[PDB]
Design a binder for this molecule. Structure first.
Ligand SMILES: Cc1cc2nc3c(=O)[nH]c(=O)nc-3n(C[C@H](O)[C@H](O)[C@H](O)COP(=O)(O)OP(=O)(O)OC[C@H]3O[C@@H](n4cnc5c(N)ncnc54)[C@H](O)[C@@H]3O)c2cc1C
Ligand code: SF4
Length: 512
């Protein structure tokens, strides 16, 4: 008989490990196991989402006729590790083999590589076919290139899937419509509200348990609205296609104080644990285009984020190896400011985004990149500490997708390995793309003096102190030219102002 192990982010009835299961003799094993349980950064809503999502999946599998062994977070016998739980399961079920789908984390994959020797039983680790490229295919793709860029890989995924393909030509005569998706947005108070799902009996029980076992963890549990069933996740997909997809590209980079969601889909939490399938989501958007529900620049832009970025990050993560997390191109050692955990900062943009993170366990892409990520980059934060924050505070966070977004795209801590450019930006960018500055005590137009937006001096200081490593970068040529034409006294005053702000950070850090 088989022991079929299914992990917390593999909540799909077509997951590879269920291939060829004998429903009457095999047993599916689901275990609420948290290796980092004592890390208080993990958002309470994320933990509640994990476990509620997993308990509904166990019930769904039983309704399908499977035999399911379930261990809760609060079970007295919970061994606290996948190995310990698999050992407890072997004792009950006396299987002749273990089937499991390859995990999405370096550390968990290695642990499972040890099952065969630790238990003396056959172990079959199956390739996770929810991704379009195997590890080997992606490695061979990268070997033929020398400089990796997402856009090359995306073109290959467009051909492999057929999405928005007319034979071997892209639908509409163009591969990518990003150029049309970059304007700022004014508020639109008729934009519909996003779907929320009231907690059912199982979710309320998880919510109470999380409050009881992680009382001092980051984040609020109030107004938990995540879908936790396959059917409700699809209701969230439907809501996005009917209400927001047609305007998705229009506002893709915009930020608004009173609208935390704009036209984003808010489906990442569901795709990443298996309640939605990535290719099914793209096909839904593609259908919307042919039925006239959305324009091409919006549909292609949406699909590019999933079979382009999301599939690319997965390949980068496995190709870069376990020690990618140690990338530190600029040699930063500064710790993460405590206001990333509290929101208690006078920078209005940072305050609002961190607050939304506290309350919702979600922020949309341009806030992760250009607000909290940009600040950490400019401030010279240790990239590993930035990594820990993003992995812990967002409900769609898993290492394989978060790490290449933090190490590569946001912090440039790999020196540009995945092909992006440095996203350093001054307060002038935030003032154009958002209305955060309108109610901020600081002034985005000032770089010196007590009123000045902190991003302005920090932007120049970042460029100045990293000049040897960045001067050849084409996209920074104009900024470095402007810098070299300032007087020595102006350059000196900008760096002294930046030092004074970094000093405020260091003095607070050397409290705790
Ligand atoms: C510092 C940083 C950390 C990030 N951490 C994560 C993370 O932990 N988990 C995560 O899923 N995404 C992460 N991203 C990518 C992106 O910000 C989120 O996927 C997005 O905000 C999810 O919101 P949404 O579902 O409304 O996406 P939408 O704006 O509706 O985008 C549609 C879908 O495309 C995918 N997608 C879009 N952008 C990216 C991207 N850059 N990389 C991978 N997939 C993408 C997601 O599946 C998303 O659901 C990160 C980006 C940055 C800059
Ligand atoms: S002024 Fe500087 S700090 Fe205040 S909001 Fe605009 S960008 Fe953020």
């Amino acid at each position: 008989s088989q022991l079929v192990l299914i992990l917390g982010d593999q909540l799909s009835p077509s997951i590879a490990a269920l291939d060829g299961v004998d429903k009457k003799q095999d047993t599916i094993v689901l275990c609420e196991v948290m290796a980092e349980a004592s890390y208080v950064g993990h958002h309470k809503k994320k933990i509640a989402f994990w476990f509620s999502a997993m308990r509904h999946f166990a019930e769904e599998l039983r309704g399908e006729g499977y035999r399911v062994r379930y261990t809760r977070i609060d079970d007295a016998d919970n061994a606290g590790s996948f190995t310990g739980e698999v050992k407890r399961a072997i004792d009950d079920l006396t299987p002749s083999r273990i089937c499991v789908t390859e995990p999405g984390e370096w550390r968990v994959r290695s642990e499972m590589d040890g099952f065969a020797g630790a238990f003396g039983i056959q172990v079959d680790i199956r390739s996770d076919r929810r991704f379009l490229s195997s590890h080997g295919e992606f490695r061979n793709w990268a070997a033929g290139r020398k400089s990796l860029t997402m856009e090359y890989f995306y073109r290959e995924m467009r051909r492999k899937t057929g999405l928005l393909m007319n034979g071997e030509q892209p639908v509409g005569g163009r591969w990518n419509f990003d150029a049309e998706n970059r304007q700022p947005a004014r508020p639109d108070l008729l934009r519909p509200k996003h779907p929320v799902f009231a907690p059912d009996k199982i979710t309320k029980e998880v919510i109470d348990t999380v409050e009881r076992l992680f009382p001092d963890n980051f984040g609020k549990l109030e107004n938990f609205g995540f879908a936790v069933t396959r059917t409700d996740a699809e209701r969230a997909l439907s809501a996005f296609i009917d209400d927001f997809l047609c305007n998705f590209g229009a506002t893709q980079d915009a930020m608004l104080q009173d609208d935390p969601n704009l036209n984003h889909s808010l489906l990442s939490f569901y795709i990443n644990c298996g309640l939605l399938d990535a290719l099914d989501v793209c096909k839904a958007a593609e259908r919307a285009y042919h039925e006239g529900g959305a324009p091409l620049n919006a549909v292609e832009g949406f699909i590019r984020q999933i079979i382009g970025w999301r599939e690319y990050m997965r390949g980068i993560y496995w190709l870069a190896g376990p020690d990618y997390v140690d990338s530190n191109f600029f040699e930063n050692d500064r710790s993460l400011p405590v206001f990333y955990w509290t929101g208690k900062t006078h920078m209005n943009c940072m305050a609002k985004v961190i607050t939304e993170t506290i309350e919702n366990a979600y922020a949309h892409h341009i806030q992760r990149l250009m607000i909290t990520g940009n600040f950490a980059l400019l401030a010279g934060i240790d990239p590993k500490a930035v990594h820990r924050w993003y992995l812990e505070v967002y409900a769609d966070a898993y290492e394989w997708v978060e790490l290449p977004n933090v190490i590569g795209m946001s912090q440039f801590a790999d020196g540009g390995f995945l092909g992006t450019k440095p996203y350093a930006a001054s307060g002038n960018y935030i003032n154009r793309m958002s209305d955060y500055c309108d109610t901020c005590r600081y002034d985005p137009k000032e770089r010196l003096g007590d009123n000045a937006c902190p991003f302005n001096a920090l932007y120049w200081d970042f460029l100045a102190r990293n000049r040897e490593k960045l001067k050849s970068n084409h996209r920074l040529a104009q900024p470095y030219a402007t810098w070299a034409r300032m007087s020595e006294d102006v350059r000196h005053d900008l760096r002294a102002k930046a030092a004074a702000f970094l000093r405020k950070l260091d003095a607070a850090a050397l409290e705790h």
